[PDB]
Amino acid sequence: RMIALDGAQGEGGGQILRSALSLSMITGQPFTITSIRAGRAKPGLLRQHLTAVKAATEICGATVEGAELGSQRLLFRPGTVRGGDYRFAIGSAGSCTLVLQTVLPALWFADGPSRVEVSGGTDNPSAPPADFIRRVLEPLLAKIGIHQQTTLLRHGFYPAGGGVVATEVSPVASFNTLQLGERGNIVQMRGEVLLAGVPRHVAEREIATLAGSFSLHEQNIHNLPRDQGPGNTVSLEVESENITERFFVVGEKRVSAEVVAAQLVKEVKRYLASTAAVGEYLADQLVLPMALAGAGEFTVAHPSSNLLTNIAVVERFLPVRFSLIETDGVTRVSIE
Numbered sequence: 056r057m058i059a060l061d062g063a064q065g066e067g068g069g070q071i072l073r074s075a076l077s078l079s080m081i082t083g084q085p086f087t088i089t090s091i092r093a094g095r096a097k098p099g100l101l102r103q104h105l106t107a108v109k110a111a112t113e114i115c116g117a118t119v120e121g122a123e124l125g126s127q128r129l130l131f132r133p134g135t136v137r138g139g140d141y142r143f144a145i146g147s148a149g150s151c152t153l154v155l156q157t158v159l160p161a162l163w164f165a166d167g168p169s170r171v172e173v174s175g176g177t178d179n180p181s182a183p184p185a186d187f188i189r190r191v192l193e194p195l196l197a198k199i200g201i202h203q204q205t206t207l208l209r210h211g212f213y214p215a216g217g218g219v220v221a222t223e224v225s226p227v228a229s230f231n232t233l234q235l236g237e238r239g240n241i242v243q244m245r246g247e248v249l250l251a252g253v254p255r256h257v258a259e260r261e262i263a264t265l266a267g268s269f270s271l272h273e274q275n276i277h278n279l280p281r282d283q284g285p286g287n288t289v290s291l292e293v294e295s296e297n298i299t300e301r302f303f304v305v306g307e308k309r310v311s312a313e314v315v316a317a318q319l320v321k322e323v324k325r326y327l328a329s330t331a332a333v334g335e336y337l338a339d340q341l342v343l344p345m346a347l348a349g350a351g352e353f354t355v356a357h358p359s360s361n362l363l364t365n366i367a368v369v370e371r372f373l374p375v376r377f378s379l380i381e382t383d384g385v386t387r388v389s390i391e
């Protein structure tokens with residue numbers, strides 16, 4: 056009944072926490088995580104973690120133990136998942152899209168449609184960008200039979216807060232089996248820069264660097280209100296026959312525009328150097344919805360630590376088994 060999870064190996068406050076919350080809500084199985092971030096200088100639950108826990112609590116009327124800052128043990132007993140309108144505030148301490156990742160899978164199982172609006176940080180280097188959710192994950196979720204639509208309403212560039220991201224979701228009626236493999240041909244490359252409170256030549260230089268390495272069929276520069284920054288991100292959308300993927304980098308303080316763009320070029324080339332449609336990050340975000348569908352597969356060039364973490368937690372809550380068969384430097388991930 057009570058699922059016991061160990062945070063000692065990493066992600067106790069992160070991916071394990073987020074996936075455990077939603078799976079717990081979905082299945083009705085309570086869980087306890089112990090040793091949350093025990094080996095970190097500031098150990099246990101951090102502010103952003105409690106926000107995620109409190110959000111899940113509100114959605115399903117949960118009882119919780121140990122939901123305090125610095126706690127290395129968390130116990131969560133879910134109640135019934137209610138649809139409806141939710142507003143969460145994670146502030147600069149966290150990522151809007153990570154709260155969304157935490158709560159949305161549960162809402163696929165609510166009794167009615169929901170809307171979730173989260174205030175806090177956007178454009179975080181360690182979270183799915185709102186546009187990634189919208190343009191990469193959501194078209195695939197739709198294929199799986201999950202219908203949700205995310206819109207960023209306001210930026211609050213990391214490490215600030217003040218951004219706003221909202222998702223509309225409806226309960227799943229029926230799941231489908233999504234099967235992905237080879238990427239197929241390029242249809243177009245789309246380069247993008249966002250700026251807030253940063254000189255416009257910075258975007259021009261970033262686009263120029265991208266163009267240096269790729270033929271860009273589309274190019275976009277968006278200058279946002281200064282108060283939403285300072286901030287700068289560069290993205291590249293790879294639209295292929297079989298999938299659309301997206302890669303982004305967050306501009307750093309003392310890093311030249313050219314270097315920032317160079318980091319993104321390297322990332323995209325690494326993706327293109329393999330045959331797989333699904334990229335490194337998307338892989339970890341497909342595991343949960345495919346496990347819930349009971350079936351599905353994709354290939355990925357490099358199974359990440361996060362992908363494996365997610366697989367393990369999912370298998371703890373659901374009687375599914377992932378196969379990961381690697382040949383020729385590409386791993387086929389299949390929900391048995």
Ligand SMILES: Nc1ncnc2c1ncn2[C@@H]1O[C@H](COP(=O)(O)O)[C@@H](O)[C@H]1O
Binds near residue numbers: 180182184187301339
């Ligand atoms: N550049 C990115 N694009 C899309 N998703 C990302 C990116 N970086 C991180 N994520 C996702 O955000 C979550 C947390 O990432 P991490 O903390 O790096 O494990 C995971 O679901 C990642 O796949």
